[PDB]
Amino acid sequence: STLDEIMKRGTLRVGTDADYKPFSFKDKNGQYTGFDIDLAKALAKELGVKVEFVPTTWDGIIPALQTGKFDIVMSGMTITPERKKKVDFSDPYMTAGQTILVKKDNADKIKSFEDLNKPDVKVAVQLGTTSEQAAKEFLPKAKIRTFENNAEAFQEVVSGRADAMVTDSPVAAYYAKLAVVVVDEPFTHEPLGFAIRKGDPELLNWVNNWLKQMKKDGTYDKLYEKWFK
Ligand SMILES: NC(=[NH2+])NCCC[C@H](N)C(=O)O
């Protein structure tokens, strides 16, 4: 079990794609910070070990996990059926819907998702995310442009090279304040979880127990309100 491996080695290795505010990012001193980071820290404490963060590109984050580059994904990861087939998820630690971001100027042209499903519309998303999937399914006439990082996608919409970007609601809000604008999607919210390799119920139970505990004893709420005020 990875649990044994973790405790022997003395360190918890957390796979994270660390340009994803407010879940995981660098502060002004290039230090790891965010909701997922604080949670990672809490879990490490529970485990009696130190934390090490393993920066990983989002698109390959599941393969990195499956090939043992780290023990656990804590990186704003939505639980999906397709992903459940590859890894195991903890109980939900959060919920996020899909939000559309546009230039304040172009806020007039865009009531909803449907308004983006035209052939002249370019929409930016992070590669390998639920936002990519949502756009590809629900905006098939549009031009979807993908990016390794959200920051570039943000940059594409500001520069005018894209008409919009789709991202998780809490990320969209965080990018808004940086004087661009949000338009909201009523269609679907989904739970986020932490991912681990299959065949490790000791670690899964431990994580779930730990999480359960933090929701019981106030520690989680303190942390939620800290990042989502
Ligand atoms: N750190 C990141 N880049 N996270 C992107 C996650 C986006 C979306 N919640 C998903 O799980 O697909």
Coordinates of all heavy atoms in Angstrom, one line a residue, residues 36-120, unseen atoms left out:
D36 N -6.0 23.7 -2.0 CA -5.5 22.3 -2.1 C -4.2 22.2 -1.4 O -3.9 21.1 -0.9 CB -5.3 22.0 -3.6 CG -6.5 21.5 -4.3 OD1 -7.5 21.2 -3.6 OD2 -6.4 21.5 -5.6
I37 N -3.4 23.3 -1.3 CA -2.1 23.2 -0.6 C -2.4 23.1 0.9 O -1.8 22.3 1.6 CB -1.3 24.5 -0.9 CG1 -1.1 24.6 -2.4 CG2 0.0 24.5 -0.2 CD1 -0.5 23.3 -3.1
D38 N -3.3 24.0 1.4 CA -3.6 23.9 2.9 C -4.1 22.5 3.2 O -3.8 21.9 4.3 CB -4.6 25.0 3.3 CG -4.0 26.4 3.3 OD1 -2.8 26.5 3.0 OD2 -4.7 27.3 3.5
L39 N -5.0 22.0 2.4 CA -5.6 20.7 2.6 C -4.5 19.6 2.6 O -4.4 18.8 3.5 CB -6.7 20.4 1.6 CG -8.0 21.0 1.9 CD1 -9.1 20.9 0.9 CD2 -8.5 20.7 3.3
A40 N -3.6 19.7 1.6 CA -2.5 18.8 1.5 C -1.6 18.9 2.8 O -1.3 17.8 3.4 CB -1.6 19.2 0.3
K41 N -1.4 20.1 3.3 CA -0.7 20.2 4.6 C -1.4 19.5 5.7 O -0.8 18.9 6.5 CB -0.5 21.7 4.9 CG 0.5 22.4 4.0 CD 0.7 23.8 4.5 CE 1.8 24.4 3.6 NZ 1.7 25.9 3.7
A42 N -2.7 19.7 5.8 CA -3.5 19.1 6.9 C -3.4 17.6 6.8 O -3.2 17.0 7.9 CB -5.0 19.6 6.8
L43 N -3.5 17.0 5.6 CA -3.4 15.6 5.4 C -2.0 15.1 5.9 O -1.9 14.1 6.6 CB -3.7 15.2 4.0 CG -3.4 13.8 3.6 CD1 -4.1 12.8 4.5 CD2 -3.9 13.5 2.2
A44 N -1.0 15.7 5.4 CA 0.4 15.4 5.9 C 0.5 15.4 7.4 O 0.9 14.4 7.9 CB 1.4 16.4 5.2
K45 N 0.1 16.5 8.1 CA 0.0 16.5 9.5 C -0.7 15.3 10.1 O -0.1 14.5 10.9 CB -0.6 17.8 10.1
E46 N -1.9 15.0 9.7 CA -2.6 13.8 10.1 C -1.8 12.5 9.9 O -1.8 11.7 10.8 CB -3.9 13.7 9.2 CG -4.7 12.4 9.3 CD -6.0 12.6 10.1 OE1 -6.2 13.7 10.7 OE2 -6.8 11.7 10.1
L47 N -1.1 12.4 8.8 CA -0.2 11.3 8.5 C 1.1 11.2 9.3 O 1.8 10.2 9.2 CB 0.2 11.4 7.0 CG -0.3 10.4 5.9 CD1 -1.5 9.6 6.3 CD2 -0.5 11.1 4.6
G48 N 1.4 12.3 10.1 CA 2.7 12.4 10.7 C 3.9 12.5 9.8 O 5.0 12.1 10.1
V49 N 3.7 13.2 8.7 CA 4.8 13.3 7.7 C 4.9 14.7 7.1 O 4.0 15.5 7.3 CB 4.7 12.3 6.6 CG1 4.7 10.9 7.1 CG2 3.4 12.6 5.7
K50 N 6.0 15.0 6.4 CA 6.2 16.2 5.7 C 5.5 16.1 4.3 O 5.2 15.0 3.8 CB 7.7 16.4 5.5
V51 N 5.3 17.3 3.8 CA 4.7 17.4 2.4 C 5.7 17.8 1.4 O 6.5 18.7 1.6 CB 3.7 18.6 2.3 CG1 2.8 18.4 1.1 CG2 2.9 18.7 3.6
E52 N 5.6 17.2 0.2 CA 6.4 17.6 -1.0 C 5.4 17.7 -2.1 O 4.6 16.8 -2.4 CB 7.4 16.6 -1.3 CG 8.2 16.8 -2.6 CD 9.2 15.7 -2.9 OE1 9.4 14.9 -2.0 OE2 9.7 15.7 -4.1
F53 N 5.4 18.9 -2.8 CA 4.6 19.1 -4.0 C 5.3 18.8 -5.3 O 6.5 19.2 -5.4 CB 4.0 20.5 -3.9 CG 3.1 20.8 -2.7 CD1 3.6 21.6 -1.7 CD2 1.8 20.3 -2.7 CE1 2.8 21.8 -0.6 CE2 1.0 20.5 -1.5 CZ 1.5 21.3 -0.5
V54 N 4.6 18.1 -6.1 CA 5.2 17.6 -7.4 C 4.5 18.4 -8.5 O 3.4 18.0 -8.9 CB 5.1 16.1 -7.6 CG1 5.7 15.7 -8.9 CG2 5.8 15.4 -6.4
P55 N 5.2 19.4 -9.1 CA 4.5 20.2 -10.1 C 4.3 19.3 -11.3 O 5.2 18.5 -11.6 CB 5.5 21.3 -10.4 CG 6.8 20.8 -10.0 CD 6.5 20.0 -8.8
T56 N 3.1 19.3 -11.9 CA 2.7 18.4 -12.9 C 1.8 19.1 -13.9 O 1.0 19.9 -13.5 CB 2.0 17.2 -12.4 OG1 2.8 16.5 -11.4 CG2 1.7 16.2 -13.5
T57 N 2.0 18.8 -15.2 CA 1.2 19.4 -16.2 C -0.2 18.7 -16.1 O -0.3 17.5 -16.0 CB 1.7 19.1 -17.6 OG1 3.0 19.8 -17.8 CG2 0.8 19.6 -18.8
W58 N -1.3 19.5 -16.1 CA -2.6 19.0 -16.0 C -3.0 17.8 -16.9 O -3.5 16.8 -16.4 CB -3.7 20.1 -16.2 CG -5.0 19.5 -16.0 CD1 -5.9 19.3 -17.0 CD2 -5.6 19.1 -14.8 NE1 -7.0 18.7 -16.5 CE2 -6.9 18.6 -15.1 CE3 -5.2 19.0 -13.5 CZ2 -7.7 18.0 -14.2 CZ3 -6.0 18.5 -12.5 CH2 -7.3 18.0 -12.9
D59 N -2.6 17.9 -18.1 CA -3.0 16.9 -19.1 C -2.5 15.5 -18.8 O -3.2 14.5 -19.0 CB -2.6 17.3 -20.5 CG -3.3 16.4 -21.6 OD1 -4.5 16.4 -21.6 OD2 -2.5 15.8 -22.4
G60 N -1.3 15.4 -18.3 CA -0.7 14.2 -17.9 C -0.7 13.8 -16.4 O 0.0 13.0 -15.9
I61 N -1.6 14.5 -15.7 CA -1.6 14.4 -14.2 C -2.1 13.0 -13.8 O -1.5 12.5 -12.8 CB -2.4 15.5 -13.5 CG1 -2.0 15.5 -12.0 CG2 -3.9 15.2 -13.7 CD1 -2.5 16.8 -11.3
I62 N -3.0 12.4 -14.5 CA -3.5 11.1 -14.2 C -2.4 10.0 -14.5 O -2.1 9.1 -13.7 CB -4.8 10.7 -14.8 CG1 -5.9 11.5 -14.0 CG2 -5.1 9.2 -14.8 CD1 -7.3 11.3 -14.5
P63 N -1.8 10.1 -15.7 CA -0.7 9.2 -16.0 C 0.4 9.3 -15.0 O 1.1 8.3 -14.7 CB -0.3 9.6 -17.4 CG -1.5 10.1 -18.1 CD -2.3 10.8 -17.0
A64 N 0.7 10.5 -14.6 CA 1.8 10.7 -13.6 C 1.5 10.0 -12.3 O 2.3 9.4 -11.7 CB 2.0 12.2 -13.3
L65 N 0.2 10.0 -11.9 CA -0.3 9.4 -10.7 C -0.2 7.9 -10.8 O 0.4 7.2 -10.0 CB -1.7 9.8 -10.4 CG -2.4 9.0 -9.3 CD1 -1.7 9.2 -8.0 CD2 -3.9 9.3 -9.2
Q66 N -0.7 7.4 -12.0 CA -0.7 5.9 -12.2 C 0.7 5.3 -12.3 O 0.8 4.1 -12.0 CB -1.5 5.6 -13.5 CG -3.0 5.5 -13.4 CD -3.7 5.5 -14.7 OE1 -3.1 5.9 -15.7 NE2 -4.9 5.0 -14.7
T67 N 1.7 6.1 -12.7 CA 3.1 5.6 -12.8 C 3.9 6.0 -11.6 O 5.1 5.9 -11.6 CB 3.8 6.1 -14.1 OG1 3.9 7.5 -14.1 CG2 2.9 5.6 -15.3
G68 N 3.2 6.4 -10.5 CA 3.9 6.6 -9.2 C 4.8 7.8 -9.1 O 5.7 7.8 -8.4
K69 N 4.5 8.8 -9.9 CA 5.3 10.1 -9.7 C 4.9 10.8 -8.4 O 5.7 11.7 -7.9 CB 5.1 11.0 -10.9 CG 5.6 10.4 -12.2 CD 6.5 11.4 -12.9 CE 7.1 10.8 -14.1 NZ 8.3 10.0 -13.7
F70 N 3.8 10.5 -7.8 CA 3.4 11.0 -6.6 C 2.3 10.1 -6.0 O 1.8 9.3 -6.7 CB 2.9 12.5 -6.7 CG 2.0 12.7 -7.8 CD1 0.7 12.3 -7.7 CD2 2.4 13.4 -8.9 CE1 -0.2 12.5 -8.8 CE2 1.6 13.7 -10.0 CZ 0.3 13.2 -9.9
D71 N 1.9 10.4 -4.8 CA 0.9 9.6 -4.1 C -0.6 10.0 -4.3 O -1.4 9.1 -4.2 CB 1.1 9.5 -2.6 CG 2.5 9.2 -2.3 OD1 2.9 8.1 -2.8 OD2 3.2 10.0 -1.6
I72 N -0.8 11.2 -4.5 CA -2.2 11.7 -4.5 C -2.3 13.0 -5.3 O -1.5 13.9 -5.2 CB -2.7 12.0 -3.0 CG1 -4.1 12.4 -3.0 CG2 -1.8 13.0 -2.3 CD1 -4.8 12.2 -1.6
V73 N -3.4 13.2 -6.0 CA -3.7 14.4 -6.8 C -4.6 15.3 -5.9 O -5.7 15.0 -5.5 CB -4.5 14.1 -8.1 CG1 -4.8 15.4 -8.8 CG2 -3.7 13.2 -9.0
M74 N -4.1 16.5 -5.6 CA -4.9 17.6 -5.0 C -4.7 18.8 -5.8 O -3.8 19.6 -5.7 CB -4.4 17.8 -3.5 CG -4.2 16.5 -2.8 SD -3.9 16.6 -1.0 CE -5.3 17.4 -0.2
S75 N -5.7 19.0 -6.8 CA -5.5 19.9 -7.9 C -6.8 20.3 -8.5 O -6.8 20.4 -9.8 CB -4.5 19.4 -8.9 OG -3.8 20.5 -9.6
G76 N -7.8 20.6 -7.7 CA -9.1 21.0 -8.2 C -9.7 20.0 -9.2 O -10.3 20.4 -10.1
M77 N -9.5 18.7 -8.9 CA -10.0 17.7 -9.8 C -11.4 17.3 -9.7 O -11.8 16.8 -8.6 CB -9.1 16.5 -9.7 CG -9.3 15.5 -10.8 SD -8.0 14.3 -10.9 CE -8.7 13.2 -12.1
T78 N -12.2 17.5 -10.7 CA -13.6 17.1 -10.8 C -13.6 15.6 -10.9 O -12.9 15.0 -11.6 CB -14.2 17.7 -12.0 OG1 -14.2 19.1 -11.9 CG2 -15.7 17.3 -12.1
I79 N -14.6 15.0 -10.1 CA -14.9 13.5 -10.2 C -15.8 13.3 -11.4 O -16.8 13.9 -11.5 CB -15.6 13.0 -8.9 CG1 -14.7 13.2 -7.7 CG2 -15.9 11.5 -9.0 CD1 -15.4 13.0 -6.4
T80 N -15.3 12.5 -12.3 CA -16.1 12.1 -13.5 C -16.1 10.6 -13.7 O -15.2 9.9 -13.2 CB -15.6 12.8 -14.8 OG1 -14.3 12.2 -15.2 CG2 -15.5 14.3 -14.6
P81 N -17.2 10.1 -14.4 CA -17.2 8.7 -14.6 C -16.0 8.2 -15.4 O -15.4 7.2 -15.0 CB -18.5 8.5 -15.5 CG -19.3 9.7 -15.2 CD -18.3 10.8 -14.9
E82 N -15.6 8.9 -16.5 CA -14.5 8.5 -17.3 C -13.2 8.4 -16.4 O -12.5 7.4 -16.6 CB -14.3 9.5 -18.5 CG -14.0 8.8 -19.8 CD -13.4 9.8 -20.8 OE1 -13.5 11.1 -20.6 OE2 -12.7 9.4 -21.8
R83 N -13.0 9.3 -15.5 CA -11.8 9.3 -14.7 C -11.9 8.3 -13.5 O -10.9 7.7 -13.2 CB -11.6 10.7 -14.0 CG -11.2 11.8 -15.0 CD -11.4 13.2 -14.4 NE -10.8 14.2 -15.2 CZ -10.8 15.5 -15.0 NH1 -11.4 15.9 -13.8 NH2 -10.3 16.3 -15.8
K84 N -13.1 8.0 -13.0 CA -13.3 6.9 -12.0 C -12.8 5.6 -12.5 O -12.4 4.7 -11.7 CB -14.8 6.9 -11.6 CG -15.2 7.8 -10.5 CD -16.7 8.1 -10.4 CE -17.4 7.2 -9.4 NZ -17.7 7.9 -8.1
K85 N -12.9 5.3 -13.8 CA -12.4 4.1 -14.4 C -10.9 4.0 -14.4 O -10.4 2.9 -14.5 CB -12.8 4.0 -15.9 CG -14.3 3.9 -16.1 CD -14.7 4.2 -17.6 CE -16.1 4.3 -17.8 NZ -16.9 3.2 -17.1
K86 N -10.2 5.1 -14.2 CA -8.7 5.1 -14.2 C -8.1 5.2 -12.8 O -7.1 4.6 -12.5 CB -8.2 6.2 -15.1 CG -8.3 5.8 -16.6 CD -7.8 6.9 -17.5 CE -8.9 7.9 -17.9 NZ -8.5 8.8 -19.0
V87 N -8.8 5.9 -11.9 CA -8.3 6.2 -10.5 C -9.5 6.2 -9.6 O -10.6 6.2 -10.0 CB -7.6 7.5 -10.4 CG1 -6.4 7.6 -11.4 CG2 -8.6 8.7 -10.7
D88 N -9.1 6.1 -8.3 CA -10.1 6.2 -7.2 C -10.2 7.6 -6.7 O -9.1 8.3 -6.5 CB -9.8 5.3 -6.1 CG -10.2 3.8 -6.3 OD1 -11.2 3.5 -7.1 OD2 -9.5 2.9 -5.8
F89 N -11.4 8.1 -6.4 CA -11.5 9.4 -5.8 C -12.0 9.3 -4.4 O -12.8 8.5 -4.0 CB -12.6 10.2 -6.6 CG -12.1 10.7 -7.8 CD1 -12.4 10.0 -9.0 CD2 -11.4 11.9 -7.9 CE1 -12.0 10.5 -10.2 CE2 -11.0 12.4 -9.1 CZ -11.3 11.7 -10.3
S90 N -11.5 10.3 -3.6 CA -12.0 10.5 -2.2 C -13.4 10.9 -2.3 O -14.0 11.2 -3.4 CB -11.2 11.6 -1.6 OG -11.6 12.9 -2.0
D91 N -14.0 11.1 -1.1 CA -15.3 11.7 -1.0 C -15.2 13.2 -1.5 O -14.1 13.7 -1.4 CB -15.9 11.7 0.4 CG -16.2 10.3 0.8 OD1 -16.8 9.6 0.0 OD2 -15.8 9.9 2.0
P92 N -16.3 13.8 -1.9 CA -16.2 15.2 -2.5 C -15.6 16.1 -1.5 O -16.0 16.1 -0.3 CB -17.7 15.6 -2.7 CG -18.3 14.2 -3.0 CD -17.7 13.3 -2.1
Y93 N -14.7 17.0 -1.9 CA -14.2 18.0 -0.9 C -14.6 19.4 -1.3 O -14.2 20.4 -0.6 CB -12.6 17.9 -0.8 CG -11.8 18.5 -2.0 CD1 -11.3 19.8 -2.0 CD2 -11.4 17.6 -3.0 CE1 -10.5 20.2 -3.0 CE2 -10.6 18.1 -4.0 CZ -10.1 19.4 -4.0 OH -9.3 19.9 -5.0
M94 N -15.5 19.6 -2.2 CA -15.8 20.9 -2.9 C -16.8 20.6 -4.0 O -16.9 19.5 -4.5 CB -14.5 21.5 -3.4 CG -14.5 22.8 -4.1 SD -14.7 24.1 -3.0 CE -15.6 25.4 -4.1
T95 N -17.5 21.7 -4.5 CA -18.2 21.7 -5.8 C -17.9 22.9 -6.6 O -17.7 24.0 -6.1 CB -19.7 21.7 -5.6 OG1 -20.1 22.9 -4.9 CG2 -20.2 20.4 -4.8
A96 N -17.9 22.7 -8.0 CA -17.6 23.7 -9.0 C -18.5 23.5 -10.2 O -18.7 22.4 -10.7 CB -16.2 23.7 -9.4
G97 N -19.0 24.6 -10.7 CA -19.7 24.7 -12.0 C -18.9 25.3 -13.0 O -17.7 25.7 -12.7
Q98 N -19.3 25.3 -14.3 CA -18.6 25.8 -15.4 C -19.0 27.3 -15.5 O -20.2 27.5 -15.5 CB -18.9 25.0 -16.7 CG -18.3 23.6 -16.7 CD -16.9 23.7 -16.3 OE1 -16.1 24.3 -17.0 NE2 -16.5 23.0 -15.2
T99 N -18.1 28.2 -15.7 CA -18.4 29.6 -15.9 C -17.7 30.1 -17.2 O -16.6 29.7 -17.5 CB -17.9 30.4 -14.7 OG1 -18.6 29.9 -13.6 CG2 -18.3 31.8 -14.9
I100 N -18.3 31.0 -17.9 CA -17.8 31.7 -19.1 C -17.3 33.0 -18.7 O -17.9 33.8 -18.0 CB -18.9 31.9 -20.1 CG1 -19.6 30.6 -20.5 CG2 -18.3 32.6 -21.4 CD1 -20.9 30.7 -21.2
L101 N -16.1 33.4 -19.2 CA -15.5 34.6 -19.0 C -15.3 35.3 -20.3 O -14.9 34.7 -21.3 CB -14.1 34.4 -18.4 CG -13.6 35.2 -17.2 CD1 -14.6 34.9 -16.0 CD2 -12.2 34.8 -16.8
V102 N -15.7 36.6 -20.3 CA -15.5 37.5 -21.5 C -15.0 38.9 -21.2 O -15.0 39.3 -20.1 CB -16.9 37.6 -22.3 CG1 -17.3 36.2 -22.8 CG2 -18.0 38.2 -21.5
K103 N -14.6 39.6 -22.3 CA -14.2 41.0 -22.1 C -15.4 41.8 -21.7 O -16.5 41.5 -22.2 CB -13.5 41.5 -23.4
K104 N -15.2 42.8 -20.8 CA -16.3 43.6 -20.4 C -17.0 44.2 -21.6 O -18.2 44.3 -21.6 CB -15.8 44.8 -19.5
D105 N -16.3 44.7 -22.6 CA -16.9 45.2 -23.9 C -17.9 44.2 -24.5 O -19.0 44.6 -24.7 CB -15.8 45.5 -24.9 CG -15.0 46.7 -24.7 OD1 -15.4 47.6 -23.9 OD2 -13.9 46.9 -25.5
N106 N -17.4 43.0 -24.7 CA -18.2 42.0 -25.4 C -19.2 41.3 -24.5 O -19.7 40.2 -24.9 CB -17.2 41.0 -26.1 CG -17.8 40.3 -27.3 OD1 -19.0 40.4 -27.6 ND2 -17.0 39.6 -28.1
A107 N -19.5 41.8 -23.3 CA -20.5 41.2 -22.4 C -21.9 41.4 -23.0 O -22.8 40.7 -22.6 CB -20.4 41.9 -21.0
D108 N -22.1 42.4 -23.9 CA -23.4 42.5 -24.5 C -23.8 41.4 -25.4 O -24.9 41.0 -25.4 CB -23.3 43.8 -25.4 CG -24.4 43.9 -26.4 OD1 -25.6 43.6 -26.0 OD2 -24.1 44.3 -27.5
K109 N -22.8 40.8 -26.2 CA -23.2 39.8 -27.2 C -23.6 38.4 -26.7 O -24.1 37.6 -27.4 CB -22.0 39.7 -28.2
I110 N -23.4 38.2 -25.4 CA -23.4 36.8 -24.8 C -24.3 36.5 -23.6 O -23.9 36.7 -22.5 CB -21.9 36.4 -24.5 CG1 -21.0 36.7 -25.6 CG2 -21.8 35.0 -24.0 CD1 -21.2 35.9 -26.9
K111 N -25.5 36.0 -23.9 CA -26.4 35.7 -22.8 C -26.0 34.4 -22.1 O -26.1 34.3 -20.9 CB -27.8 35.6 -23.4
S112 N -25.7 33.3 -22.9 CA -25.5 32.0 -22.4 C -24.5 31.1 -23.2 O -23.9 31.6 -24.1 CB -26.8 31.2 -22.3 OG -27.2 30.7 -23.6
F113 N -24.3 29.9 -22.8 CA -23.5 28.9 -23.6 C -24.0 28.8 -25.0 O -23.1 28.8 -25.9 CB -23.7 27.5 -23.0 CG -22.5 26.7 -22.6 CD1 -21.3 27.3 -22.5 CD2 -22.7 25.4 -22.3 CE1 -20.2 26.5 -22.2 CE2 -21.6 24.6 -22.0 CZ -20.4 25.1 -21.9
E114 N -25.3 28.7 -25.2 CA -25.8 28.7 -26.6 C -25.3 29.8 -27.5 O -25.0 29.6 -28.7 CB -27.3 28.6 -26.6 CG -27.9 27.2 -27.0 CD -27.1 26.6 -28.2 OE1 -26.9 27.3 -29.2 OE2 -26.6 25.5 -28.0
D115 N -25.1 31.0 -26.9 CA -24.7 32.1 -27.7 C -23.2 32.0 -28.2 O -22.8 32.7 -29.1 CB -24.8 33.4 -26.9 CG -26.3 33.8 -26.7 OD1 -27.2 33.0 -26.9 OD2 -26.5 35.0 -26.2
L116 N -22.5 31.1 -27.6 CA -21.1 30.8 -28.0 C -21.0 29.7 -29.1 O -19.9 29.5 -29.6 CB -20.2 30.4 -26.8 CG -19.8 31.5 -25.8 CD1 -19.1 31.0 -24.6 CD2 -18.9 32.5 -26.5
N117 N -22.1 29.0 -29.3 CA -22.1 27.9 -30.3 C -22.3 28.4 -31.7 O -23.2 27.8 -32.4 CB -23.2 26.9 -29.9 CG -23.1 25.6 -30.7 OD1 -22.1 25.3 -31.2 ND2 -24.2 25.0 -30.8
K118 N -21.6 29.4 -32.1 CA -21.6 29.9 -33.5 C -20.3 29.6 -34.1 O -19.3 29.4 -33.4 CB -21.8 31.4 -33.4 CG -23.3 31.8 -33.5 CD -23.8 32.2 -32.1 CE -24.1 33.7 -32.2 NZ -24.0 34.3 -30.9
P119 N -20.2 29.7 -35.5 CA -18.9 29.2 -36.1 C -17.8 30.3 -36.1 O -16.6 29.9 -36.3 CB -19.3 28.9 -37.5 CG -20.8 29.0 -37.6 CD -21.2 29.9 -36.5
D120 N -18.1 31.5 -35.9 CA -17.1 32.6 -35.8 C -16.6 32.8 -34.4 O -15.6 33.5 -34.2 CB -17.7 34.0 -36.3 CG -19.1 34.2 -35.7 OD1 -19.7 33.4 -34.9 OD2 -19.7 35.3 -36.0

